[PDB]
Amino acid sequence: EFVPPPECPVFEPSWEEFTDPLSFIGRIRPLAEKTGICKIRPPKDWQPPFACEVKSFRFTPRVQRLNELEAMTRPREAFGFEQAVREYTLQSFGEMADNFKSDYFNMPVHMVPTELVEKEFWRLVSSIEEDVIVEYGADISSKDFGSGFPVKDGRRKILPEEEEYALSGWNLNNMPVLEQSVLMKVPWLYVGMCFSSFCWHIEDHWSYSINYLHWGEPKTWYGVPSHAAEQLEEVMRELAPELFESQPDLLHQLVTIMNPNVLMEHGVPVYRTNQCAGEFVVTFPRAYHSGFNQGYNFAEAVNFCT
């Protein structure tokens, strides 16, 4: 079955090192740049409150058919109308997500080993006999219902115990986002359920990205260092569906799902991590990454510049 890639680096900075994100990322770069991704665990006392407007938080998630590329191998009757379209609140999405996972594995959602969800995910992606369909609240703009981090503005109220987090350099709203040049830049939200996923991609302009899991079950990641970017792209073209082979990268990476073991078999280095609630994941410039969610969770991401 699936062989898990080696673990990416995890850093546990002291309060002194936790002072400036860009200074810290600059210092860990000699190691983290060689794995493409790294995980950062903040000091134990660093616990930002969740600041989204939860009562009015409503969204229509995207439908994900795990084996859609494998099923390209007579089209189905009335294709394009498989799943009925559902709108959710945070609470009703969570109820759906937990019922899906507990029903799927026949055990309570917190008892399912992360290694089993991983093994099953990659089996389902390549399975022609079983068609599993899930939903992902992905790419929700933080301008919609606010950031998960507290921010200083007239939108909501900030308590004194909250203000340190509104002002923190690790608040994703306070990251630098303006690239220097001769002359949408806000965080985005992701409401996950078991098996919801993001396929292999790099960021626009080869940007760094930083990713925070506010709460919930882990987000499983795979990363490739930037020195292997060209090798991954060559493996993709060789093994991607012929109909998509000529597509430009920006469109191709909407459907570049590929088992990490296939890349490893072709000599591409791949690292993994389970990002748990309260942890950051940083992706380095031109570091390909992909992943999936273990269950109901809430993440926030932003592209930043150095």
Ligand X SMILES: CCN(/C=C/N(C)C)C(=O)CNCc1cc(C(=O)O)ccn1
Q: State the residues that interact with ligand X by CB under 6 A.
A: 138-139, 188, 190, 198, 203, 209, 211, 219, 289, 299, 301-303
CA dihedral 262, 192, 48, 160 (to 10 degrees): 160
Q: Where are the alpha helices (DSSP H) in the chain?
A: 21-32, 90-105, 114-125, 142-145, 160-167, 229-239, 249-252, 260-265
Q: Which does 138 bind (CB under 5 to 8 A by kind): ligand X, Mn ion, none?
A: ligand X
Cβ proximity to Mn ion, 147 vs 150, nearer residue: 147
User: How far is residue 175's CA from residue 46's CA, in Å, rounded to a whole number?
Assistant: 17
Q: Residue 274: helix, strand or coil by DSSP?
A: strand
Q: What's the closest the beta carbon of residue 9 comes to ligand X, in angstroms? A: 17
214 is known to lie in a ligand binding site: no
Note whether 102 and 192 are within 8 A (CB). Answer: no
Q: Which does 303 bind (CB under 5 to 8 A by kind): Mn ion, ligand X, none?
A: ligand X
Q: What's the closest the beta carbon of residue 292 comes to ligand X, in angstroms? A: 9
200-219: which residues touch Mn ion (CB under 5 A)? 209
In 3D space, the residue among 62, 71, 65 whose CA is nearest the CA of residue 241 turns out to be 71
Cβ proximity to ligand X, 100 vs 190, nearer residue: 190
Cβ proximity to ligand X, 294 vs 303, nearer residue: 303
Check residue 155 and report its DSSP letter: S
Q: Which does 299 bind (CB under 5 to 8 A by kind): ligand X, Mn ion, none?
A: ligand X
Note whether 217 and 297 are within 8 A (CB). Answer: yes
Q: Which does 188 bind (CB under 5 to 8 A by kind): ligand X, Mn ion, none?
A: ligand X
212 is known to lie in a ligand binding site: no
Q: Which residue is nearest to Mn ion (CB)?
A: 209
- Binding site for Fe cation, by residue number, is 201, 203, 289
